[PDB]
Symmetry: C4
Subunit: 256 residues, 4 copies
């Protein structure tokens, strides 16, 4: 309808986006002020009302989107569902209201494209992430059996071992705090910890670089399609089209 | 034979892979439960029997593979030999039973391709890895002679020096824990430690990046061959084929 | 005019650049000597006069540039404005005189091209930098509310939380110094800190790699234009020109 | 001459290289044994004679090379000069005899090519390395003036400041050990240290990545020339040759 189209044109405008962005910033700003324990009862009540006002605007915003697009229809987009879930959860009296500042990502298209490039890059690194999970699980079992009776605060159970192996992987006090004390009791403990550090720091870097390279390439195409209407074809496809042109030229030549 | 082909078709199926994967997970799960020191005698005996059941399945699995393929023949693949070695070692009554969770890598083709890309990338970085080994050995000898008499816990012998130089390379308490105390006795010790850190962190990063770049390219070809039957030709070869087509066109033209 | 052209040719020469570079180095050298608290009154007065001499040369240098180019005109370049701002601020009797050693960057063209490649690369990473800012802000609010009453030195207010979350992101004593003590009171604190470390170290690396890749490509073009007069065309444009040549050949052929 | 050619063919052989490599390893092995303080007088005297034997072989090796190639002539190669300098310095009775294990690099061609790729990559990163030097110098002067009177062990002079800023850049105890104690006296010290960490870790990574990318590409060409006799032409040159072929085809066509 004409009314549905007039609302969709209003929602899709730059001015509507700037209003919603400003209210997300305002809501984020009042929640950060609400962390201040020294505030008076009146100052806290005022900020709580400003938070209530920001939330009511988001309910009106989402409701306008459900009418202008539909109920099949708005919910067909993961970014709208995320925006709905975040505002609908606040209407049910969890505790972490500051998570609605994540809406900046969904409302700003350039930020939205960066995050969807990272999410689309995750399937392609799943095998590397599973290999890291396997290495961590094997190492956690070994460390519990080897050092749990002598160092129970760090290796007393599987949970404790997973925690201190994550610490060891991040190279945080790994030697002065963990392995030099462990070696005072188990002199050959370096045989376990030095290869564990070599393997996990390498795997983590591999996983991170895999995400960065894919996400950069994916975002580069999404940004191109959002501006021009399409993306740049790969060099291999351009060389195939050039090769097909050479085949068409050779076919037209030598005969007819 | 018809029986050998029916077994090979069963082994190569997706359902057989999912059964073996589930039993590896189950075995890994019971071994992690066996780390719990608070367990009763009955609970431990039950898990030990479940571990025995998982192992007997793997013996039947490997035996089925030796019949369906051969004895020259199954052992012609490094992934089958690895699977054989890991299950045959358990039948000899070492201590680290959790290493059979590494079978997930050999059983899942996507994980198998990630690991073989990393292993195939190792020869190409051997010279960088040897340079790191040389720098570490030279530095360990120097540090033993320079600081061993005054700091014997850290540099008393070659083994102690290799250990604390690995710690220094990982930047773990390098200054507050090692070099500021060493400098209280040897004021110019920074002349040794700051270039050592500059050289080794650089070489380690070079080695790691070398593996990541090669492994990514190698896996990209192995994944392509496993799905399509072949891999994408390099841009230089495509440009050579295009160049050869231009030579064939020029030869057919100007004369005949 | 002939005088204006003779000054511009003097300014643009290699010898004038080497004189200005030497005076920047000299000024930097005397300021580093002025950090020495053990210096006599005469030694300090001498260095203060040498600093005064270096500054008067820069005033003459800038004044020569304003005459040889203009007042619209010299100030049309960001590198000249930076050079003007840095010398004009010294004539107003802030405290950090050593910031004029940054002039080496503006005076040496190779260093100037490296820095402008980094600055030109910043817009393209703005969305990633904003995502990091959002994650840090959300995390700072959460950490203040969760741990501020029990750990006020680290999380007592928003400012304190932003500081210790930056420390946590850099992996500095994150576990032995912050999270193991926090977990003694809040056993599930790892649920907050381990994903925060995973997200921020990843985002920081993404931001840094984004700057490095773009800056390298941008500098590579600026260095080419400064030497040859132009830069290398992209492979996609070269393939488009080759494709356009094949279209012109096919059009000239088959007819006329 | 026939004798000079027979020696050059002996020097250039694989067997001569394997003998020299074995003696370098042997020399390195005895020097590592000489770090052992518990050794008897006879055991030490024996190893000292083995070290003397290894050195005499190197003198004969270098002397054979000076005859087979010349005196203009052997010294025309940086790798021969390095080999000469390292063996000639031992004949003058400095202290660090283990530096002759660096000869492995010069004797093994694959290791030699890795190191020359790194050295050839250094000029191209000189501007980034100078920018890091400038930032470190400015920061060292600022930190001496700001914190030297209150924290003289860390910032008492320029040398002390350069040392603890290098520590801060490596993120080693930067907060718990340096900046939290400094902030107890100077509450706004984070304004200096957090941007310093942001700038230097970024610049170091930029410098390291710049070396890794260039060194990889340079070694890839040197390895190709050492095996095939030449290196692979860039994609831009191949596209220029293809473009030149299209120009020659178009010129031969439409007329004659
Ligand atoms: C890379 C994967 C890294 C996973 C790290 C998981 C750590 C789990 C830590 C944990 O569960 N506890 C802390 C042990 O210190 C125990 C508490 O849950 C109790 O309640
Ligand atoms: C990058 C290569 C890094 C290699 C690191 C090797 C460390 C060897 C450590 C070592 O052998 N000991 C620990 C010294 O603290 C001595 C014990 O073996 C005793 O039994
Ligand atoms: C990635 C963004 C990281 C931003 C880090 C900001 C830290 C702000 C630290 C701060 O303001 N204080 C130190 C708290 O310890 C308080 C003092 O300002 C008082 O005067
Ligand atoms: C990135 C460049 C990093 C350069 C680091 C230079 C450190 C210089 C350290 C230094 O000179 N001293 C140690 C101060 O603790 C003083 C001693 O020389 C006295 O004799
Ligand atoms: Na650290
Ligand atoms: Na670190
Ligand atoms: Na640390």
């Amino acid at each position: 309808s004409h009314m549905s189209r007039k609302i969709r044109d209003l929602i899709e405008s730059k001015r509507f986006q700037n209003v919603i962005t400003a209210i997300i910033v305002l809501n984020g700003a009042v929640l950060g002020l609400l962390t201040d324990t020294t505030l008076s009862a009146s100052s806290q009540n005022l900020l709580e009302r400003v938070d209530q006002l920001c939330l009511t605007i988001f309910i009106v915003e989402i409701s306008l989107k459900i009418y202008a697009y539909g109920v099949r229809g708005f919910f067909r987009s993961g970014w709208n569902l995320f925006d709905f879930v975040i505002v609908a959860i606040a209407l049910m009296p969890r505790t972490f209201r500051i998570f609605r500042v994540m809406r900046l990502v969904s409302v700003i298209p350039t930020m939205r494209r960066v995050v969807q490039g990272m999410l689309l890059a995750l399937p392609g690194v799943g095998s590397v992430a599973a290999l890291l999970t396997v290495v961590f699980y094997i190492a956690a079992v070994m460390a519990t059996n080897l050092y749990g009776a002598t160092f129970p605060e760090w290796f007393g159970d599987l949970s404790k071992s997973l925690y201190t192996l994550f610490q060891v992987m991040t190279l945080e006090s790994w030697s002065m705090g963990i392995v030099r004390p462990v070696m005072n009791v188990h002199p050959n403990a370096w045989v376990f910890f030095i290869p564990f550090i070599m393997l996990t720091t390498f795997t983590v870097l591999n996983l991170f670089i895999g995400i960065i390279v894919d996400a950069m390439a994916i975002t580069k195409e999404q940004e191109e399609e959002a501006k021009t209407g399409h993306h740049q074809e790969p060099i291999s496809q351009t060389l195939l089209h050039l090769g097909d042109r050479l085949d068409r030229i050779e076919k037209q030549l030598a005969q007819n």
